[PDB]
């Protein structure tokens, strides 16, 4: 709940208001994971927030 972050595996460009654009290697907090395919995430690396494809991240663990 504050102990885990995820790492971006690939670059992703959002053209939607609510998606997050990110680069591979960013450190992300998962905010909402109620759905399996799209998660609300916050990038600690950029300070930006938005939905991400869950297949584009893996736990940093
Ligand atoms: Ni935690």
Numbering used by the authors: 81 to 141
Kindly provide excerpts from the paper associated with this entry:
The structures of the monomeric form of the WT (WTM) and Gln128Glu mutant (Q128EM) of the c-Src-SH3 domain were solved from crystals belonging to space group P212121 with two molecules in the AU. For comparison of the two monomeric crystal structures superposition of chains A of the WTM and Q128EM structures were carried out, resulting in a RMSD value of only 0.15 Å. In both monomeric structures, the side-chain of residue Glu106 in chain A (Glu106A) is hydrogen-bonded to Ser123A side-chain and two water molecules, thereafter W1 and W2. A third water molecule, W3, is placed at hydrogen-bond distance of Gln128A side-chain (or Glu128A in the Gln128Glu mutant), the carbonyl atom of Ser101A and W2. However, in chain B, Glu106B side-chain is hydrogen-bonded to Thr125B side-chain (2.8 Å) instead of Ser123B side-chain (distance between Glu106B and Ser123B is 5 Å). W1 and W2 molecules linked to Glu106B side-chain are also maintained, but not W3: the latter is present in the WT structure, but not in the mutated one. In the Fyn-SH3 domain, and in the c-Src-SH3 Gln128Glu mutant, the presence of two negatively charged glutamate residues in the folding nucleation site would result in the electrostatic repulsion among the residues buried in the hydrophobic pocket. This repulsion might favour the intermediate-like structure in chain B, where the glutamate side chain is oriented outside the pocket formed by the distal loop. Remarkably, the mutation of glutamine by glutamic acid results in a change of the pH where amyloid fibril formation occurs: Gln128Glu mutant develops amyloid fibrils at neutral pH but not a mild acid pHs. The case of the Gln128Glu mutant amyloid fibril formation is different from the WT protein as it takes place at neutral pH where the protein is monomeric even at high concentrations (>20 mg·ml−1).
The non-receptor c-Src tyrosine kinase participates in different signaling processes by phosphorylation of tyrosine residues in a variety of proteins, modifying their properties, such as enzymatic activity, subcellular localization and stability. The c-Src tyrosine kinase is made up of six functional regions: (i) a N-terminal fatty acid-acylation domain, (ii) a unique domain, (iii) a Src homology 3 (SH3) domain, (iv) a Src homology 2 (SH2) domain, (v) a catalytic domain, and (vi) a C-terminal regulatory domain. Of all those, the SH3 domain plays a key role in the regulation of the tyrosine kinase activity through the recognition of an intramolecular Proline Rich Motif (PRM) and, additionally, through the interaction with other PRMs present in other proteins. To better understand the mechanism of 3D-domain swapping formation in c-Src-SH3 domain, and its plausible implication in amyloid fibril formation, we have solved the crystallographic structures of the WT and three mutants at position 128 of the c-Src-SH3 domain.
